[PDB]
Amino acid sequence: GQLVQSGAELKKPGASVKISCKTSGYRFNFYHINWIRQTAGRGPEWMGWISPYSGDKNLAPAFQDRVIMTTDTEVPVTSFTSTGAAYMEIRNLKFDDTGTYFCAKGLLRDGSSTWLPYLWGQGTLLTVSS
Amino acid sequence: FLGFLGAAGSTMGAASMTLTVQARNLLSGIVQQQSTVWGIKQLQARVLAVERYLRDQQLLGIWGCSGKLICCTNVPWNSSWSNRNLSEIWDNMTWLQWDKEISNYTQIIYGLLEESQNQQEKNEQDLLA
Amino acid sequence: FLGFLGAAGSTMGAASMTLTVQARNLLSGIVQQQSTVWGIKQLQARVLAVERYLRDQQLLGIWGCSGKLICCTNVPWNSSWSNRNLSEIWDNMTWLQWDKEISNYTQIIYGLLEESQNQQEKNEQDLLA
Amino acid sequence: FLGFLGAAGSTMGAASMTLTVQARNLLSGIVQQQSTVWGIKQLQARVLAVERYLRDQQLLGIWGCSGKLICCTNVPWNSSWSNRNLSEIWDNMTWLQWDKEISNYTQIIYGLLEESQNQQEKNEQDLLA
Amino acid sequence: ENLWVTVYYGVPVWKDAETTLFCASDANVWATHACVPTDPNPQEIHLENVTEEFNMWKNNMVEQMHTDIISLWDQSLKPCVKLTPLCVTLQCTNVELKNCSFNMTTELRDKKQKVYSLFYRLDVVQINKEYRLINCNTSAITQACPKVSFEPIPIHYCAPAGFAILKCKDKKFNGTGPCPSVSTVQCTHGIKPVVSTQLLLNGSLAEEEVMIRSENITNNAKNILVQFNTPVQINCTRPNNNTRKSIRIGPGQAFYATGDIIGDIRQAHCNVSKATWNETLGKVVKQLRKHFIRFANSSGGDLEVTTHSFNCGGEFFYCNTSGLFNSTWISNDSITLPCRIKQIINMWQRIGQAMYAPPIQGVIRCVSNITGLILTRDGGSTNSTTETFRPGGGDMRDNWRSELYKYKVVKIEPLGVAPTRCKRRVV
Amino acid sequence: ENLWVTVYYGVPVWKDAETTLFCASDANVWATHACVPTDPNPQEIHLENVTEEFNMWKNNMVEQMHTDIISLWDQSLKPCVKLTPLCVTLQCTNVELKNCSFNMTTELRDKKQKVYSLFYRLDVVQINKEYRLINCNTSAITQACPKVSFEPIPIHYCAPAGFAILKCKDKKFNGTGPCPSVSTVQCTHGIKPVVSTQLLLNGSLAEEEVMIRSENITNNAKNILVQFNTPVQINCTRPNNNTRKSIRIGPGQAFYATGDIIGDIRQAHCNVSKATWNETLGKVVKQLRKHFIRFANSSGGDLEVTTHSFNCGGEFFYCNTSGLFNSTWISNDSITLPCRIKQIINMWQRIGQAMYAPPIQGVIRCVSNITGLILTRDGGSTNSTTETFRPGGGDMRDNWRSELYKYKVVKIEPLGVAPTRCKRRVV
Ligand SMILES: *[C@@H]1O[C@H](CO)[C@@H](O[C@@H]2O[C@H](CO)[C@@H](O[C@@H]3O[C@H](CO[C@H]4O[C@H](CO[C@H]5O[C@H](CO)[C@@H](O)[C@H](O)[C@@H]5O)[C@@H](O)[C@H](O[C@H]5O[C@H](CO)[C@@H](O)[C@H](O)[C@@H]5O)[C@@H]4O)[C@@H](O)[C@H](O[C@H]4O[C@H](CO)[C@@H](O)[C@H](O)[C@@H]4O)[C@@H]3O)[C@H](O)[C@H]2NC(C)=O)[C@H](O)[C@H]1NC(C)=O
Ligand SMILES: *[C@@H]1O[C@H](CO)[C@@H](O[C@@H]2O[C@H](CO)[C@@H](O[C@@H]3O[C@H](CO[C@H]4O[C@H](CO[C@H]5O[C@H](CO)[C@@H](O)[C@H](O)[C@@H]5O)[C@@H](O)[C@H](O[C@H]5O[C@H](CO)[C@@H](O)[C@H](O)[C@@H]5O)[C@@H]4O)[C@@H](O)[C@H](O[C@H]4O[C@H](CO)[C@@H](O)[C@H](O)[C@@H]4O)[C@@H]3O)[C@H](O)[C@H]2NC(C)=O)[C@H](O)[C@H]1NC(C)=O
Ligand SMILES: *[C@@H]1O[C@H](CO)[C@@H](O[C@@H]2O[C@H](CO)[C@@H](O[C@@H]3O[C@H](CO[C@H]4O[C@H](CO[C@H]5O[C@H](CO)[C@@H](O)[C@H](O)[C@@H]5O)[C@@H](O)[C@H](O[C@H]5O[C@H](CO)[C@@H](O)[C@H](O)[C@@H]5O)[C@@H]4O)[C@@H](O)[C@H](O[C@H]4O[C@H](CO)[C@@H](O)[C@H](O)[C@@H]4O)[C@@H]3O)[C@H](O)[C@H]2NC(C)=O)[C@H](O)[C@H]1NC(C)=O
Ligand SMILES: *[C@@H]1O[C@H](CO)[C@@H](O[C@@H]2O[C@H](CO)[C@@H](O[C@@H]3O[C@H](CO[C@H]4O[C@H](CO)[C@@H](O)[C@H](O)[C@@H]4O)[C@@H](O)[C@H](O[C@H]4O[C@H](CO)[C@@H](O)[C@H](O)[C@@H]4O)[C@@H]3O)[C@H](O)[C@H]2NC(C)=O)[C@H](O)[C@H]1NC(C)=O
Ligand SMILES: *[C@@H]1O[C@H](CO)[C@@H](O[C@@H]2O[C@H](CO)[C@@H](O[C@@H]3O[C@H](CO[C@H]4O[C@H](CO)[C@@H](O)[C@H](O)[C@@H]4O)[C@@H](O)[C@H](O[C@H]4O[C@H](CO)[C@@H](O)[C@H](O)[C@@H]4O)[C@@H]3O)[C@H](O)[C@H]2NC(C)=O)[C@H](O)[C@H]1NC(C)=O
Ligand SMILES: *[C@@H]1O[C@H](CO)[C@@H](O[C@@H]2O[C@H](CO)[C@@H](O[C@@H]3O[C@H](CO[C@H]4O[C@H](CO)[C@@H](O)[C@H](O)[C@@H]4O)[C@@H](O)[C@H](O[C@H]4O[C@H](CO)[C@@H](O)[C@H](O)[C@@H]4O)[C@@H]3O)[C@H](O)[C@H]2NC(C)=O)[C@H](O)[C@H]1NC(C)=O
Ligand SMILES: *[C@@H]1O[C@H](CO)[C@@H](O[C@@H]2O[C@H](CO)[C@@H](O[C@@H]3O[C@H](CO[C@H]4O[C@H](CO)[C@@H](O)[C@H](O)[C@@H]4O)[C@@H](O)[C@H](O[C@H]4O[C@H](CO)[C@@H](O)[C@H](O)[C@@H]4O)[C@@H]3O)[C@H](O)[C@H]2NC(C)=O)[C@H](O)[C@H]1NC(C)=O
Ligand SMILES: *[C@@H]1O[C@H](CO)[C@@H](O[C@@H]2O[C@H](CO)[C@@H](O[C@@H]3O[C@H](CO)[C@@H](O)[C@H](O)[C@@H]3O)[C@H](O)[C@H]2NC(C)=O)[C@H](O)[C@H]1NC(C)=O
Ligand SMILES: *[C@@H]1O[C@H](CO)[C@@H](O[C@@H]2O[C@H](CO)[C@@H](O[C@@H]3O[C@H](CO)[C@@H](O)[C@H](O)[C@@H]3O)[C@H](O)[C@H]2NC(C)=O)[C@H](O)[C@H]1NC(C)=O
Ligand SMILES: *[C@@H]1O[C@H](CO)[C@@H](O[C@@H]2O[C@H](CO)[C@@H](O)[C@H](O)[C@H]2NC(C)=O)[C@H](O)[C@H]1NC(C)=O
Ligand SMILES: *[C@@H]1O[C@H](CO)[C@@H](O[C@@H]2O[C@H](CO)[C@@H](O)[C@H](O)[C@H]2NC(C)=O)[C@H](O)[C@H]1NC(C)=O
């Protein structure tokens, strides 16, 4: 399956930005959708995940109050695949929030690592500047 | 408990723990008062149900599993059927897409099963002093 | 030997030693020359016999007893079903009044049987190193 | 592999190694489009096949062999049935002339089988401390 | 790390299958005789996470129901009185409806009787006054038994054991496609076999928005099925107070002639609340525009297919729908529709025989829910300029598709083979 | 040295059995409706070393096929138009064939019509000119539906599961006896149910030498079956260019009368190449002499059994075989045989009803393989002086024996008990 994220946005510090993540080639309702970021100063940082099926969310404490993760309802394609869309809106941007953001499909439907990011999108570049 | 076919969308293991519901609710018995087109229909359908059931039971018995449900064999899993490891199969696919992925090689597996069981029984016949 | 249902009035143990006569004489096979109302009847009755037989065999198999006749389970006898000791049951009542006394709780016993057997089979699946 | 009944003229052992082909190809399933004299016929034949199959499976189960194919018993071979040694029987006669030679005493053997199995099961019931 | 195959019996696996279904009823020769009474409580088991493809146009339950209704119709018509001798030359005078006197065989072979009956204009044609029934030169005729009722009662279509029926519970579900919410049932809901043309009667209503279902929208040849979310009400009455005259035409045989009219000289009609029909028509054109507007009548010659044909109380009504389909849309005062009555009908005279609907004594009045419609486009003109919609009821199968759209038949394949790290105990 | 019984399931054991067989077709009301289509590839499994006894005369497949053809004939004749009213007094004039005018009920009960039809001499008899159809005083009559075809198409007789059909593949195999080469099949080959008398049509040909099969050769009462190794060709034509006149005799009923002849005044006939028939007759008398010679016609009164009776294109031909059976043997120029035509036939009027074969418009011409013969000896004279053979077609079952000679029905007894040195594990 393919994960296609929104392209890129330039935002001023203090503003907000909303990144999208449209999915296809797999059942969107079944695998968790994670949001992970990468900046040059702090390296890789896991932000949170959301379940397209139940709406359950788990946010890292560093982003619990400024990040909003949402999902749409899966659009069926055949029976074993579908198309979907998840969104992440990050607000109060700062210079250290500049980096690449990824949405990622989980590994297994059940087990010891269900949410584990397995299939990744191409990434969305967020620049915070004046 | 979810009911008949309740775990159709579940993982293969989640459904595998409750195969007995689906297996039991497979045979009905819906009495009668036909004493007619409707009667011909009800009589014809009656036969087909237990017919499929007995075909499946025949297959179960000619594989060394007339006791139904869960049984193991001496046939190794040839990698050419599917290349997925255990975790992926039992916690990423449902039984429907599984049978879709393995329908190409189902009858070969059935033949391997019958032959392994026949060799086991020949060994049993050899197995006395 | 007393014949089919000969031990119906006997003690449950006396009948239990000769359940096989009743079990065997349960399936017939009465040929034909119907080549008509009578034919519709004979065809309809044909189905019902083996239908009940296969329902009973289905129940036997989904309890871990597809080999028929006498089998034991892991289900403890909950005293709420009947409070009689062993001597009273096996040497004071016949099978008819027994099934009358336990018909209230038959299906619960059947469910306990199926579930105990399913757990045994899950253990069997776990049972390899 | 020779096919259904391919070893009919073979030695009893040569056929015995491949009884499973004949046993499997015993049950068919030939769909339908009868939706008539022909329909009455096809429906009547449908019943008789699985009827004979279930009679044979009933016999297999009431002998302690519901798992089908090859099983052994506690019944000794009374010399009055046939006086031939092992080599002669398994490498000089086919199954057809064998069943011709033993058809006189088939039902007695069946009764001995059922009774030996029933005594084994009574022993099983006795078999706990 | 060593894998071996293991057999699983009772795996949730099914495949698309066509099998011979059976009926179910409980509360009328067609379904009261039916078959086995329905279970006190049906089990509808929701199947979480399951998305299954449905196709109402390639559905076999429709063809099965169609042939079943046909065969039941013949089985109920066979024992009744066939009016082959009623093809005597008729001498008719005016009262539309005509008073016809004719000879008829009595019970004694040698004796004859002159009787008179009232016949609607559609049943009779002149030759050279002398008249004959329209059917007498095309086919034989048989009279529907008076006891049997043409009132449709709900009939549940059931699948045999080892098979299952899948039911899409998606409210916005298109006719065909993947259904995200699926439950399984042994039998469908109570489907009334309402014989109708153009507008659908006594069907089931779609939840949320009304539904437009075609096999191909852009193709004019494929009809258009409409299912309401809100039912409209239609009251149909035959005001004439007819009388039934039983005249004996042989040993046992008895023809039911139409006696002289009692009461008004008014033709049967149906009212529909204009307010509710304007709301429903608005929502219809909104769902029509979701894929694209005027509405015109259909004019195709056969009265029984050009008019809203149906059965009510045992009389067969054929209704001018022009009041409902004279409109143009670019986004109580109940309308009244005239209905003529036929007692001779040929929906399958060539397959078999014609039917004489016996006259019904007294005034007729039935109230019906109008739940659906059946439409058709014109021939493609200059594209995207204007679109015209005329109502049709060309076939009866579309009614079965209209109530079988949510159901689907599958066979259970309980045999699954899967790899585990398990080997049987060595001999 | 200690032997114990052990059960074997699936032993190659079978016993002679008679069961209800079923049909199979794929490519005509009798077999196109048939049953289940045949498998794409049939499995014929040779059974090495196996010698099995066959008996074509005590075979039940023959009686089964006979009753099946009879029941199918009745089931296809039942819905068609019965010509009970066509027994009106006929006024007939000469054109053999006779032009008959008669009254007939119209559609209206009171009106009558005078129509004329052409009738072959065999169908009508005079009483006191005034005539009637020959059947009207013996039995009722019904007209074969024009759509159904009397062309025999191959029908495969199949055994149910748990049973099997044994097929003798011995080329020189006598009718009855032990067959050294036997294979097993679920269904027979495509057998065309050709209704014939005397000579056999469209059968299967014996390989190597032609085959003479009787139940007892020395017994005159038992017929003689002949199967060719080389098929002879026979071309049968009805040159008259008949015309069909559909006259309506009631609501729906329609009689198909014979219009005036177009073309020649020639009677139907069949040619057979004299060279090929002389070769075939020579090989026949050689196989006859293998058990022992002149050939004469049979003269027994009933035209339908004395003549090569058959059906071609829907017309029933009855042929003078005198050109084929005028010979004496002590070790293109095609012969031509005259054939008369009947449209009223009674092969079972007493069991049931008679059939009116509808007239066939235009000229008729069918080409048939003549594969077999049915013969009979005279009464025993002075022994070994001379032997005389006349052709007969006394019964239809002999045709079924002619194609069922190689097949046999058995039931599988998969239960074998045998001694091994094996005991079950002690409890
Ligand atoms: C239909 O398909 C869907 C989608 O595929 C499928 O749903 C999946 O089901 C599988 C198994 O059935 C799930 O895998 C399991 O997940 C279990 C639940 O995860 C727990 O953790 C969440 C995070 O909790 C944190 O945050 C909260 C605050 O949010 C905080 O309070 C906590 O303390 C913690 O910090 C939690 O939110 C989540 O809660 C949801 O679910 C509970 C019920 O469990 C409910 O009460 C809530 O309201 C909320 O909806 C939940 O608590 C997890 O427990 C489990 O791990 C154990 O089990 C496995 C065996 O299964 C063991 O191997 C393992 O060692 C653990 O012991 C496992 O990971 C999967 O997450 C679902 N979702 C997917 C895949 O997207 C349905 O089951 C399918 N249904 C059918 C019928 O087919
Ligand atoms: C239908 O219902 C009836 C009624 O319920 C039922 O009959 C009961 O059957 C059960 C078992 O089937 C019986 O219980 C057994 O009884 C056995 C018989 O008792 C013996 O003792 C009697 C006394 O003998 C003394 O007196 C005589 C002179 O009269 C003297 O010569 C003796 O030496 C001795 O001093 C004796 O009269 C009696 O004789 C009757 O029966 C014999 C056949 O046995 C017959 O030949 C006679 O003509 C007479 O009719 C008999 O000899 C007893 O042996 C047995 O105890 C042994 O077996 C049990 C296992 O069953 C062992 O556990 C135990 O250790 C002993 O080894 C047991 O007590 C019961 O008595 C019957 N009657 C009732 C309950 O009223 C039928 O069976 C039912 N039938 C069906 C088909 O359902
Ligand atoms: C139908 O019925 C027939 C008749 O009853 C039956 O045929 C019998 O089948 C059984 C077993 O199926 C046979 O018994 C076996 O015979 C095997 C073959 O014998 C070998 O020896 C022959 C002699 O060889 C010498 O001469 C040649 C030159 O001629 C020389 O080159 C050699 O070096 C040597 O010096 C040889 O000719 C013969 O060859 C035939 O067969 C081979 C195939 O094997 C073929 O290639 C040839 O073209 C030729 O046709 C053959 O090589 C023998 O191997 C076997 O012994 C072994 O097996 C048994 C187990 O079966 C072991 O216990 C034993 O220890 C050995 O390891 C055994 O003796 C019997 O001979 C047949 N004939 C009879 C009985 O007359 C069919 O099978 C039946 N079929 C069905 C379907 O029912
Ligand atoms: C489908 O549409 C048709 C018409 O197209 C309807 O037919 C009408 O049905 C109504 C019944 O609801 C009939 O109404 C009757 O009217 C009588 C006269 O009233 C007129 O006069 C007064 C004063 O002049 C006006 O105010 C009034 O508006 C009318 O113009 C009444 O006398 C009748 O009342 C009856 O009941 C009372 C109480 O029980 C008695 O005391 C009276 O004596 C009387 O028996 C009645 O209300 C109307 O006449 C019908 N019209 C026609 C043309 O027939 C159908 O009802 C409608 N629905 C269907 C068919 O389902
Ligand atoms: C769409 O669905 C609706 C709902 O089912 C159908 O409406 C039914 O229409 C039928 C007419 O075909 C109605 O049946 C007839 O009702 C008449 C009026 O009933 C009144 O009187 C009875 C007396 O017992 C009361 O119990 C009742 O409550 C009413 O007050 C009766 O006169 C009729 O009886 C005659 O026929 C029956 C059946 O053959 C015979 O047994 C009788 O002896 C008598 O000869 C008949 O009962 C029915 O009531 C309506 N149902 C409802 C719920 O209103 C529509 O017809 C349907 N649409 C189409 C096109 O069919
Ligand atoms: C069964 O047996 C019957 C007779 O018992 C056969 O009937 C004959 O069929 C043939 C067709 O093969 C007919 O032959 C026709 O002959 C016409 C005249 O030819 C005669 O004259 C010439 C010169 O005088 C002689 O040399 C010759 O031998 C004949 O004596 C021809 O003119 C016909 O030709 C047609 O075709 C050509 C080319 O297409 C056209 O240009 C011609 O104009 C013409 O249309 C034709 O060849 C013969 O007449 C038939 N005899 C009778 C008595 O009817 C059956 O054919 C045979 N087989 C069956 C029934 O299957
Ligand atoms: C022994 O076996 C042979 C071989 O099967 C039989 O020969 C068949 O004889 C039948 C007549 O009973 C033939 O059927 C008829 O053939 C006529 C000629 O066909 C020509 O025209 C068609 C046009 O489509 C061509 O396709 C074809 O190739 C030929 O060139 C047709 O005119 C007939 O059609 C009429 O009947 C059919 C069936 O009822 C209707 O559907 C039609 O609408 C029409 O009314 C008919 O098809 C058949 O072709 C012959 N088969 C062969 C292979 O030659 C012998 O009859 C049989 N012996 C006996 C005693 O039955
Ligand atoms: C649907 O509407 C069409 C019109 O678009 C109807 O056809 C028209 O019906 C009217 C009846 O009011 C006809 O008027 C009459 O025509 C006759 C013809 O003999 C004439 O003699 C009368 O004086 C009167 O004018 C009109 O001609 C006719 N036009 C056409 C083109 O058909 C149609 O009947 C309606 N059908 C349905 C099913 O609603
Ligand atoms: C088989 O051959 C026999 C002869 O052995 C046929 O019988 C004979 O048929 C001929 C017809 O050519 C008869 O000749 C005619 O007889 C009539 C009688 O009325 C007579 O009027 C004529 O002048 C002419 O002579 C002959 O009598 C007759 N003989 C006998 C004994 O029957 C028979 O018809 C042939 N049948 C078949 C089925 O081939
Ligand atoms: C019914 O709805 C389905 C969607 O559920 C339609 O399917 C789409 O059809 C178009 C063709 O115009 C395709 O391009 C899409 O890819 C289809 N979508 C899916 C999910 O399959 C279907 O066309 C509709 N049917 C009608 C008659 O309108
Ligand atoms: C068909 O052929 C068999 C041989 O395959 C004939 O059987 C023989 O019949 C004669 C009687 O005249 C006996 O004496 C022989 O012993 C039989 N041989 C066998 C091997 O059984 C049979 O008679 C032939 N049938 C006919 C009608 O000629």
Quick check: F93 and F87 in contact, CB under 8 A?
Answer: no
Helix (H) or strand (E) holding F311: strand F308-312
Residues 6 or more apart from B52 whose CB is under 8 A from it?
E162, E411
Helix (H) or strand (E) holding F6: strand F4-9
What chain B residue is nearest to D13 in terms of C-alpha separation? B122
Beta-bridge mates of residue F312: F315
| E84 part of contact set with chain F, CB < 8 Å | yes
Q: Tell me, in angstroms, the distance from the centre of ligand 6 to residue F202's CA.
A: 27
The full DSSP string for E262-303 is BS-----EEEE-HHHHHHHHHHHHHHHHTT--EE-----S-H
Q: Which two tokens stand for residue F313?
A: 């294109």
- Taking residue D79's Cβ as centre, other Cβ atoms within 10 Å add up to 10
β E24-25/E36-37 pair status: parallel
HSE-up of residue E298 (Cα within 13 Å, Cβ side): 26
Question: Which atom of ligand 11 lies nearest, measured to the CA of F173?
Answer: 5
Q: Which residues in chain B have Cβ-Cβ distances shorter than 8 Å to E68?
A: 37
Residues D70, D16: Cα–Cα separation, whole Å:
9
Q: Which two tokens stand for residue E9?
A: 């019996």
Quick check: F317 and F310 in contact, CB under 8 A?
Answer: yes
Q: Please tell me the distance in Å from F159's CA to the nearest CA on chain D.
A: 8
Residues A75, E178: Cα–Cα separation, whole Å:
9
F–A contact: 3+ Cβ pairs < 8 A: no
- Taking residue E373's Cβ as centre, other Cβ atoms within 10 Å add up to 26
β A82-90/E200-201 pair status: unpaired
| D121 part of contact set with chain C, CB < 8 Å | yes
The distance of Cα E15 from the centroid of its chain, to the nearest Å, equals 30
Residue D107, amino acid: Q
Question: Which atom of ligand 3 lies nearest, measured to the CA of D9?
Answer: 83
Quick check: E48 and E169 in contact, CB under 8 A?
Answer: no
- Taking residue F14's Cβ as centre, other Cβ atoms within 10 Å add up to 23
Size of chain C, expressed as the number of residues it contains: 129
Measured at the CA of E410, the angle between CA E404 and CA E415, to 5 degrees, comes to: 170
Interface C-F, measured as beta-carbon pairs within 8 A, has a size of 3
Q: Which two tokens stand for residue A36?
A: 């992970």
Give the DSSP letter of residue A110.
Answer: S
β F407-412/F163-168 pair status: antiparallel
The full DSSP string for F314-332 is TEEEEE--TTTS-EE----
Q: Which of C32, C33, C8, C34 is nearest to C19 (CA)?
A: C8
Beta-bridge mates of residue F130: F91
Neighboring chains of C (3 or more beta-carbon pairs < 8 A): B, D, E, F
Measured at the CA of E355, the angle between CA E351 and CA E358, to 5 degrees, comes to: 170
| C121 part of contact set with chain B, CB < 8 Å | yes
Residue at token pair 């079978």: F14
With H, G, I as helix, E, B as strand and everything else as coil, classify residue E354.
strand
Helix (H) or strand (E) holding E365: strand E362-377
Q: Tell me, in angstroms, the distance from the centre of ligand 7 to residue F152's CA.
A: 11
Residues 6 or more apart from E418 whose CB is under 8 A from it?
B12, B16, B89, B90, B98, E5, E6, E8
If you count DSSP H runs as helices and E runs as strands, how many of each does chain E have, helices first? Answer: 4, 32
Residue E44, amino acid: E
**Residue F272, exposed/middle/buried by CB under 10 A (0-12, 13-18, 19+)?**
buried
The distance of Cα B99 from the centroid of its chain, to the nearest Å, equals 11
With H, G, I as helix, E, B as strand and everything else as coil, classify residue E163.
strand
Give residue limits of the domains in chain C. Answer: 5-128
Give residue limits of the domains in chain A. Answer: 1-130
Interface E-F, measured as beta-carbon pairs within 8 A, has a size of 35
Give the DSSP letter of residue E123.
Answer: G
Mutate to test the pocket of ligand 1, among A105, A109, A115, A118 (most ligand atoms within 8 A of CB): A109
Q: Which of A101, A128, A130 is nearest to A117 (CA)?
A: A101
Residues D86, D92: Cα–Cα separation, whole Å:
10
Residues 6 or more apart from A47 whose CB is under 8 A from it?
A34, A35, A36, A37, A59, A60, A63, A67, A88, A101
Q: Which residues in chain F have Cβ-Cβ distances shorter than 8 Å to D23?
A: 9-10, 414
Helix (H) or strand (E) holding B125: helix B106-126
Q: Which two tokens stand for residue A33?
A: 């959708």
Q: Please tell me the distance in Å from B58's CA to the nearest CA on chain E.
A: 12
Q: How far apart are the first and last CA of chain A?
A: 38
- Taking residue E308's Cβ as centre, other Cβ atoms within 10 Å add up to 24
Distances (CA, A) of D1 to D13, D22, F167: 15, 11, 20
Q: For F74-162, where are the E strands, in sequence order? A: 90-94, 98-105, 112-119, 124-126, 130-133, 141-143
The dihedral of CA C57, C62, C66, C69: what is its sign?
Answer: negative
Compute chain E's Rg from CA coordinates: 26
Q: Which of F52, F67, F46 is nearest to F410 (CA)?
A: F52
| B121 part of contact set with chain D, CB < 8 Å | yes
The distance of Cα A8 from the centroid of its chain, to the nearest Å, equals 14
Q: Please tell me the distance in Å from E51's CA to the nearest CA on chain A.
A: 5
Size of chain D, expressed as the number of residues it contains: 129
Measured at the CA of C122, the angle between CA C116 and CA C127, to 5 degrees, comes to: 120
What chain B residue is nearest to D23 in terms of C-alpha separation? B62
Q: Which two tokens stand for residue F76?
A: 């296809």
Q: Which two tokens stand for residue C16?
A: 């239990």
Long-range CB contact pairs, C76-80, < 8 A, 24+: C80/C105
CB neighbour burial string for F170-205, b if at least 16 within 10 angstroms, e if fewer: beebbbbeebebbbbbbbbebbbbbbbbbbbbbbbe
- Angstrom resolution of this structure: 4.1
Q: Which residues in chain E have Cβ-Cβ distances shorter than 8 Å to A27?
A: 49, 51
Phi-psi region of E177 (alpha: psi -120 to 50; beta: other; left: phi over 0): left
Q: Which two tokens stand for residue C90?
A: 């096996």
Architecture of the domain whose range is A1-130: Sandwich (2.60)
Residue at token pair 């409210």: E171
Distances (CA, A) of E369 to E230, E233, E366: 10, 5, 10
Residues F205, F203: Cα–Cα separation, whole Å:
7
Beta-bridge mates of residue B6: none
Quick check: E197 and E310 in contact, CB under 8 A?
Answer: yes
Name the percent of chain A in helix, strand, coil, to the closest 5: 5, 50, 45
Mutate to test the interface with B, among E1, E2, E9 (most CBs of B within 10 A): E9
Strand order in the sheet with E415-420: B70-76, E4-9, E415-420
- 52-91 in chain C: CB under 8 A from chain F: none
Q: Tell me, in angstroms, the distance from the centre of ligand 9 to residue F97's CA.
A: 21
Residues E425, C124: Cα–Cα separation, whole Å:
11
Residues C129, F98: Cα–Cα separation, whole Å:
98
Residue E132, amino acid: R
Asked if E87 and F110 come within 8 Å (Cβ–Cβ), the reply is no
Q: Which residues in chain C have Cβ-Cβ distances shorter than 8 Å to E418?
A: none
Q: Which phi and psi (to 5°) does residue F411 adopt?
A: -110, 140
| B41 part of contact set with chain D, CB < 8 Å | no
What chain E residue is nearest to B74 in terms of C-alpha separation? E423
Ligand 6 neighbours, Cβ below 6 Å, are F 235, 237, 271, 336
The full DSSP string for F146-202 is SSS------B--BPPTTEEEEEE--TT--SSEEESSEEEESB---B----BSSSEES
Residues E12, F376: Cα–Cα separation, whole Å:
68
The full DSSP string for B74-95 is EEE--TTT----HHHHHHH--H
β E98-105/E90-94 pair status: antiparallel
Q: Which two tokens stand for residue F205?
A: 């040909």
Residues 6 or more apart from F411 whose CB is under 8 A from it?
D52, F14, F15, F17, F19, F162, F163, F164
Compute chain A's Rg from CA coordinates: 14
Quick check: C98 and C90 in contact, CB under 8 A?
Answer: no
Q: Which residues in chain D have Cβ-Cβ distances shorter than 8 Å to B121?
A: 69-70
Residues 6 or more apart from E170 whose CB is under 8 A from it?
E179, E180, E181
